């Protein structure tokens, strides 16, 4: 490739990695909500299992 082409590809890749950083921050910020959803679903599943075991 042209030298300038390689440099421009490198700039685009740098932008991609900064975007990936933003994605990682987003994923980290949503740990608590994911835990809450997991807990609510676990409670629902446990209640269903206990209720069906009653019979």
């Amino acid at each position: 490739v042209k030298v300038l082409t390689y440099f421009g590809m490198t700039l685009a890749a740098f932008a991609f990695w900064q975007s990936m950083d933003k994605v990682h921050v987003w994923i980290a910020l949503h740990q608590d909500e994911k835990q809450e959803r997991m807990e609510k679903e676990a409670e629902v599943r446990r209640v269903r299992a206990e209720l069906l075991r009653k019979a």
């Binding site: 980290a28 910020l29 740990q31 608590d32």
Partner: protein, 64 residues
């Protein structure tokens, strides 16, 4: 788990590993060693520590 540290001393998480292994070596149910196991894994990845600190940062960003 090996105990060989990268700077020539006992590995950071090796005492937790050994407590967990010694627990499991005589407890016939692994659920009795759950706490020690999650302590070992917390030492490897610091997941709960970082999650709690991120909660603190979140509340700071919410109250500002």
């Amino acid at each position: 788990a090996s105990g060989w540290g990268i700077t020539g001393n006992k590995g950071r998480c090796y005492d937790f590993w050994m407590d967990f292994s010694e627990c499991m070596s005589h407890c016939r149910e692994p659920k009795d060693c759950t706490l020690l196991r999650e302590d070992y894994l917390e030492c490897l990845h610091h997941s709960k520590e970082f999650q709690r600190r991120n909660r603190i940062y979140k509340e700071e960003q919410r109250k500002l």
